[PDB]
Paper text:
Enzymatic degradation of PET using suitable hydrolases, like the leaf branch compost cutinase (LCC) variant ICCG, offers potential for PET recycling under relatively mild reaction conditions. Computer-aided enzyme engineering performed by Tournier et al. introduced an Ile at LCC position F243 to enhance the enzyme’s catalytic activity by further expanding the substrate-binding site. Additionally, thermostability was increased to 94 °C by disulfide bond formation between D238C and S283C in combination with mutation Y127G. In this study, ICCG was utilized for the application of a crystal contact engineering strategy to increase crystallizability and test the rationality of the applied approach.
Therefore, ICCG protein was heterologously produced with E. coli and purified via IMAC and SEC consecutively, as described in Section 2.2 and Section 2.3. Here, orthorhombic ICCG crystals grew in 2 out of 384 tested reservoir solutions within two weeks: 3 crystals (50–100 µm) grew in 0.8 M succinic acid (pH 7.0), and 12 crystals (50–100 µm) grew in 1.0 M succinic acid, 1% (w/v) PEG 2000, 0.1 M HEPES (pH 7.0). Additionally, the cutinase ICCG is not easily crystallizable, as the success rate of the HTP screening process shows (2/384 conditions). As a result, crystallization was not reproducible for ICCG in batch experiments with the crystallization conditions obtained from HTP screening, tested using 0.4–1.8 M succinic acid and 0–5% PEG 2000 (2.5–10 g L−1 protein). For ICCG, two purification steps (IMAC and SEC) were required to crystallize in HTP screening, with no crystallization in subsequent batch crystallization experiments. Molecular structure analysis revealed a change in the crystal system for ICCG (space group I222) and ICCGY (space group P41212). The change in the crystal system of ICCG(Y) from I222 to P41212 is associated with a denser-packed ICCGY crystal structure, resulting in smaller crystal channels. Also, the two space groups are formed by varying crystal contacts, resulting in different neighboring amino acids for L50 and L50Y. Given the complexity of the crystallization process, with many factors affecting the crystal symmetry, the changing space group could result from the difference in protein solution homogeneity and thus, potentially varying oligomeric states. Additionally, the change in the crystallization method, influencing the external conditions, may have impacted the space group.
Numbering used by the authors: 1 to 259
The structure:
Amino acid sequence: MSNPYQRGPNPTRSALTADGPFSVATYTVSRLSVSGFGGGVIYYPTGTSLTFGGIAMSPGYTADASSLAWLGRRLASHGFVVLVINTNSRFDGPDSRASQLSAALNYLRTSSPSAVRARLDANRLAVAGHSMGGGGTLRIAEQNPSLKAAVPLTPWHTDKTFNTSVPVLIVGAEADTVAPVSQHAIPFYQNLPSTTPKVYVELCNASHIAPNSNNAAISVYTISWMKLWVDNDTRYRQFLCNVNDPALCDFRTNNRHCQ
């Protein structure tokens, strides 16, 4: 076997900025059915009988899974099972959101409808989250080394050091005034262990709400990082190596993923 996990056509930067090749179905996880997180929406591939890796995603300065619907759908369409949670509360802090992400991942493994479980390879799991949720991503990554990848988006957290070996790609927003890049995203990046694969990208002319609507840069880098590590799909290395992107105002990496 070459790469059992590889999915979809050969990628072009262009295709990575709109919904991908797989058809997508959704399933609402009602708040009324689960314990350690609010509800959620699972986005998953139909029209295929391959299994995909799984992603749990936390919303940002709200409880609403709808705020990241575009990106749950987006990642799904490129070949993922994606559970976007609602949080228990509007005001849940990063560490509680880490708990909720944990619960959503267990939900995916143990509790999802048969339609979903069928598309899912529960051995290949990753996390993403906006803001507060992004801080959660770092915490949960620190606690579960078996996660494939973490993608914090304009992350916010009071703690600055996370001891994780999970590959991290952080998206900062240059004009973010709620989680300023130099007090949040960049410290997170710098404090990760030296041996962990990591990338920081900073969106020019974007604020904390940048992840809340369709966004080409967030799309390209999130899809590529997920593909690279969840799927071991090195065809995605090209979007994360020798990067040159006018959308970006900063780019930092230890370049372990270009090996």
